[PDB]
mmCIF file of C-alpha atoms in Angstrom:
data_model
loop_
_atom_site.group_PDB
_atom_site.id
_atom_site.type_symbol
_atom_site.label_atom_id
_atom_site.label_comp_id
_atom_site.label_asym_id
_atom_site.label_seq_id
_atom_site.Cartn_x
_atom_site.Cartn_y
_atom_site.Cartn_z
ATOM 1 C CA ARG A 100 163.292 72.954 -93.333
ATOM 2 C CA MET A 101 161.795 72.960 -89.828
ATOM 3 C CA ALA A 102 161.248 69.441 -88.558
ATOM 4 C CA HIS A 103 159.347 70.853 -85.587
ATOM 5 C CA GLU A 104 155.836 72.050 -86.453
ATOM 6 C CA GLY A 105 153.520 69.927 -84.301
ATOM 7 C CA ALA A 106 153.603 67.989 -81.021
ATOM 8 C CA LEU A 107 155.041 64.480 -81.230
ATOM 9 C CA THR A 108 152.570 61.776 -80.192
ATOM 10 C CA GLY A 109 153.872 59.583 -77.382
ATOM 11 C CA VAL A 110 154.771 55.955 -78.132
ATOM 12 C CA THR A 111 154.656 54.493 -74.629
ATOM 13 C CA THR A 112 150.847 54.622 -75.094
ATOM 14 C CA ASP A 113 150.867 50.795 -74.957
ATOM 15 C CA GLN A 114 153.004 49.173 -77.686
ATOM 16 C CA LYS A 115 156.123 50.223 -79.598
ATOM 17 C CA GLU A 116 155.600 48.545 -82.988
ATOM 18 C CA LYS A 117 152.245 48.626 -84.813
ATOM 19 C CA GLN A 118 151.701 45.323 -86.620
ATOM 20 C CA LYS A 119 148.840 44.297 -88.911
ATOM 21 C CA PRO A 120 146.006 42.097 -87.455
ATOM 22 C CA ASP A 121 146.022 38.324 -88.192
ATOM 23 C CA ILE A 122 144.371 35.547 -86.156
ATOM 24 C CA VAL A 123 145.815 32.073 -85.442
ATOM 25 C CA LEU A 124 143.725 28.886 -85.531
ATOM 26 C CA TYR A 125 143.622 25.302 -86.908
ATOM 27 C CA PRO A 126 143.125 25.391 -90.716
ATOM 28 C CA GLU A 127 143.823 21.658 -90.664
ATOM 29 C CA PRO A 128 140.692 19.693 -89.653
ATOM 30 C CA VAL A 129 141.145 17.330 -86.674
ATOM 31 C CA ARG A 130 139.307 14.100 -85.766
ATOM 32 C CA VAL A 131 139.363 12.243 -82.436
ATOM 33 C CA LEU A 132 137.579 9.154 -81.088
ATOM 34 C CA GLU A 133 135.371 9.522 -77.999
ATOM 35 C CA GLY A 134 137.275 8.799 -74.795
ATOM 36 C CA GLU A 135 140.172 10.976 -75.896
ATOM 37 C CA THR A 136 140.876 14.502 -74.759
ATOM 38 C CA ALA A 137 141.290 17.075 -77.509
ATOM 39 C CA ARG A 138 143.575 20.105 -77.460
ATOM 40 C CA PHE A 139 143.298 23.103 -79.768
ATOM 41 C CA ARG A 140 144.652 26.639 -79.597
ATOM 42 C CA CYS A 141 142.861 29.865 -80.551
ATOM 43 C CA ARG A 142 144.617 33.190 -80.017
ATOM 44 C CA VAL A 143 144.896 36.459 -81.952
ATOM 45 C CA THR A 144 147.901 38.649 -82.815
ATOM 46 C CA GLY A 145 149.190 41.688 -84.719
ATOM 47 C CA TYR A 146 147.141 43.967 -82.447
ATOM 48 C CA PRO A 147 147.122 44.524 -78.615
ATOM 49 C CA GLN A 148 144.568 42.563 -76.522
ATOM 50 C CA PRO A 149 141.620 42.832 -79.012
ATOM 51 C CA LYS A 150 138.018 41.680 -78.357
ATOM 52 C CA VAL A 151 137.423 38.339 -80.080
ATOM 53 C CA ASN A 152 134.980 35.488 -79.608
ATOM 54 C CA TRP A 153 134.596 31.935 -80.956
ATOM 55 C CA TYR A 154 132.094 29.161 -81.736
ATOM 56 C CA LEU A 155 132.546 25.565 -80.520
ATOM 57 C CA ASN A 156 130.772 22.960 -82.679
ATOM 58 C CA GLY A 157 129.000 26.128 -83.863
ATOM 59 C CA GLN A 158 128.162 27.341 -80.335
ATOM 60 C CA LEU A 159 129.239 30.780 -79.067
ATOM 61 C CA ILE A 160 130.430 31.224 -75.444
ATOM 62 C CA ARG A 161 131.971 28.198 -73.669
ATOM 63 C CA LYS A 162 131.970 27.464 -69.916
ATOM 64 C CA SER A 163 134.584 29.116 -67.690
ATOM 65 C CA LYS A 164 136.704 27.496 -64.930
ATOM 66 C CA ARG A 165 135.497 24.100 -66.208
ATOM 67 C CA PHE A 166 137.678 24.651 -69.290
ATOM 68 C CA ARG A 167 140.743 26.865 -69.805
ATOM 69 C CA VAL A 168 139.307 30.046 -71.264
ATOM 70 C CA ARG A 169 140.086 33.748 -70.907
ATOM 71 C CA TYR A 170 138.261 36.415 -72.879
ATOM 72 C CA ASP A 171 141.172 38.732 -73.646
ATOM 73 C CA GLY A 172 142.519 37.237 -76.871
ATOM 74 C CA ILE A 173 143.381 33.851 -75.234
ATOM 75 C CA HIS A 174 141.017 30.885 -75.789
ATOM 76 C CA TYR A 175 142.014 27.182 -75.467
ATOM 77 C CA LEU A 176 139.515 24.378 -76.212
ATOM 78 C CA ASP A 177 140.018 21.420 -73.818
ATOM 79 C CA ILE A 178 137.303 18.738 -74.027
ATOM 80 C CA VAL A 179 137.717 15.886 -71.527
ATOM 81 C CA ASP A 180 134.287 16.118 -69.904
ATOM 82 C CA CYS A 181 133.838 12.725 -71.564
ATOM 83 C CA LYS A 182 131.189 14.102 -73.942
ATOM 84 C CA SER A 183 132.998 14.194 -77.273
ATOM 85 C CA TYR A 184 131.086 11.694 -79.469
ATOM 86 C CA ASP A 185 129.575 14.475 -81.573
ATOM 87 C CA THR A 186 130.821 15.851 -84.879
ATOM 88 C CA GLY A 187 130.372 19.628 -85.251
ATOM 89 C CA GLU A 188 132.047 22.770 -86.611
ATOM 90 C CA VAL A 189 134.225 25.479 -85.131
ATOM 91 C CA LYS A 190 134.379 29.042 -86.449
ATOM 92 C CA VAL A 191 136.409 31.886 -84.951
ATOM 93 C CA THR A 192 135.981 35.614 -85.600
ATOM 94 C CA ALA A 193 137.705 38.693 -84.215
ATOM 95 C CA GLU A 194 136.979 42.377 -83.813
ATOM 96 C CA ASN A 195 139.277 45.374 -83.816
ATOM 97 C CA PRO A 196 138.665 49.160 -84.055
ATOM 98 C CA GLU A 197 140.769 49.018 -87.256
ATOM 99 C CA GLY A 198 140.205 45.418 -88.456
ATOM 100 C CA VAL A 199 137.910 42.412 -88.589
ATOM 101 C CA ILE A 200 138.827 38.791 -89.448
ATOM 102 C CA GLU A 201 137.130 35.411 -89.903
ATOM 103 C CA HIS A 202 138.239 31.793 -90.445
ATOM 104 C CA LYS A 203 136.281 28.507 -90.762
ATOM 105 C CA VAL A 204 137.531 25.069 -89.702
ATOM 106 C CA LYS A 205 135.886 21.620 -89.318
ATOM 107 C CA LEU A 206 136.154 19.350 -86.251
ATOM 108 C CA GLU A 207 134.468 15.929 -86.233
ATOM 109 C CA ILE A 208 134.492 13.636 -83.184
ATOM 110 C CA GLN A 209 133.883 9.924 -83.848
ATOM 111 C CA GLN A 210 133.719 7.259 -81.111
ATOM 112 C CA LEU A 211 135.694 4.488 -79.375
ATOM 113 C CA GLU A 212 139.500 4.368 -79.383
ATOM 114 C CA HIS A 213 140.550 1.079 -81.007
ATOM 115 C CA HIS A 214 141.259 0.964 -84.730
ATOM 116 C CA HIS A 215 139.994 -1.778 -87.011
ATOM 117 C CA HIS A 216 142.214 -4.820 -87.625
ATOM 118 C CA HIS A 217 142.416 -7.867 -89.901
ATOM 119 C CA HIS A 218 144.708 -10.640 -91.090
#
C-alpha cells in the first residue's frame, strides 16, 4: 500500500535506457585484390562504452595514428599501407561486467586488380 519503502536509485548515472549487449561486425566474408584499400567497421552496442578488443588477420592490437582506431568501443580497419596481398582471418570479441560476446569472420586478400577476360 506504501510505494515508498526504500531510496530510489538515480537514473542520470550515465544512461536512461538499459539495453542488452550485442556487437556489430561483418558476418559476410569480403575479398579484395592487392592495390585496393579495404574498409570495414567494428563497433559494439547495447551497453555504454564497454572494453572490447579485436584480431586482424588473427593478430590482436593494431597500430594507432597510422590507422583509424580508438579503444573505447570504436575500431575501424583501414588497410592502404599497400601491404594487403595476404589472406588471413579476423575475429572480434567483447567484454562487459554483465556480458561477453564473440563472432568469427573470414577476410582473404588476393592480388592485382584486373579481372580475367576472354573472347
